[PDB]
Design a protein around this nucleic acid. Structure first.
Ligand SMILES: Nc1ncnc2c1ncn2[C@H]1C[C@H](O)[C@@H](COP(=O)(O)OP(=O)(O)OP(=O)(O)O)O1
Ligand SMILES: [Ca+2]
Ligand SMILES: [Ca+2]
Length: 341
DNA sequence: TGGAATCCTTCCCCC
DNA sequence: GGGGGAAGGATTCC
């Protein structure tokens, strides 16, 4: 068992660089304009030029202009990055058949049937970093170990433009040494529960009675951290498929009025239906982001697939259900479509 | 901001 | 008691 994990660096920004090389050397910030005010929006990502000054994914765009008033700010062109990504995936598909496409910018490859050890793996690493640098002009970080979680961690250490092997002895210290907050799947809310439980490192997971751990963070998560800690996590590489498709959009004002919201909602369905493209959903959800950034959703499953005129009419009922059941104003509104035939 | 997975808890119908 | 749903929310990650 030997897993290789690949992670395209500062991806959306690097793609705008590849597309206009003049941009190299300059701090680049790829933004998502919400279009309420001027520069209402958030940061989708920035190159390391910008990132070293605090500008990063999820700070408002106004906050990023106060730090770097002369950086280059580009609106997000997703469809573009979506295609460049595909082309690269295809490249890796020739390095192995066992390949999990994790996100727009990550993939793990099972390379047992291709390689004999951590030296031969390394070489395959550089063989690939190179081939992507060559064909597509994009730098990636490569992390390597016995499973996916440690391949990913390896990569976090080695970024950007890095390559790294975490071998079976280094995994051993890391269970003791690694801060559990730095484990994939443990976000701020689990990190805090785990601290008040006495777990700051991966290895303190064993010192607790399981059923207390289950009681704090869930079973699924508890079994995960446990197996990880017993050098015993070993989930395989899967070809995961889209389970849902949707679209959420921001209104120029916060509103409670049904006629004010509807056309935002209809545009969301429209784009959603395009994105489906010969896919037929059985489930529609209406998601609202209320004025204080809380998220409330109402939905419905059908026995048949959903056509557009049915998605139109049913979506308005579920939005009604939200206004009725929740007293707050509405900042964002959209749809998600799941349960494909 | 915008997208999408997965888990958990609760409710329900019913052997 | 338990299987099998669905629905709504919570959490994470990119
Ligand atoms: N919070 C976000 N909001 C919008 N888009 C995001 C967000 N996070 C990530 N993305 C998008 C843009 C990123 O380029 C892409 C990949 O994310 P990610 O791999 O974590 O970091 P990154 O590619 O920007 O740089 P890095 O090399 O540091 O990981 O997904
Ligand atoms: Ca990356
Ligand atoms: Ca974290």
């Amino acid at each position: 068992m030997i897993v290789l994990f690949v992670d395209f660096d500062y991806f959306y920004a690097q793609v705008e660089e590849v597309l206009n090389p003049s941009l190299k050397g300059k701090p680049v910030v790829v933004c998502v304009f919400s279009g309420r005010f001027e520069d209402s929006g958030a940061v989708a990502t920035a190159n390391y030029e910008a990132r070293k000054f605090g500008v990063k994914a999820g700070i408002p765009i106004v906050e990023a202009k106060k730090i770097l008033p002369n950086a280059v700010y580009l609106p997000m062109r997703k469809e573009v990055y979506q295609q460049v990504s595909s082309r690269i995936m295809n490249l890796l598909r020739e390095y192995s058949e066992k390949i999990e496409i994790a996100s727009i910018d990550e993939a793990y490859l099972d390379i047992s049937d291709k390689v004999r050890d951590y030296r031969e793996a390394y070489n395959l690493g550089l063989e690939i970093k190179n081939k992507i640098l060559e064909k597509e002009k994009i730098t990636v970080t490569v992390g390597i170990s016995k499973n996916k979680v440690f391949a990913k961690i390896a990569a976090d250490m080695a970024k950007p433009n890095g390559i790294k092997v975490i071998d079976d002895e280094e995994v051993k210290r890391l269970i003791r040494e690694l801060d559990i907050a730095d484990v994939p799947g443990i976000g701020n809310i689990t990190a805090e529960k785990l601290k008040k439980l006495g777990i700051n490192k991966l290895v303190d997971t064993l010192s607790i009675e399981f059923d207390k751990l289950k009681g704090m963070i869930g079973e699924a998560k508890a079994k995960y951290l446990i197996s990880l800690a017993r050098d015993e996590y070993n989930e395989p590489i899967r070809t995961r498929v889209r389970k849902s498709i949707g679209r959420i959009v921001t209104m120029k004002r916060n509103s409670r009025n049904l006629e004010e919201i509807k056309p935002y909602l209809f545009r969301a369905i429209e784009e959603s239906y395009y994105k489906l493209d010969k896919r037929i959903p059985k489930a529609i959800h209406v998601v609202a982001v209320t004025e204080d950034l809380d998220i409330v959703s109402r939905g419905r499953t059908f026995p048949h697939g959903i056509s557009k005129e049915t998605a139109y009419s049913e979506s308005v009922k579920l939005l009604q259900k939200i206004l009725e059941e929740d007293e707050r104003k509405i900042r964002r509104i959209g749809v998600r479509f799941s349960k494909f035939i």
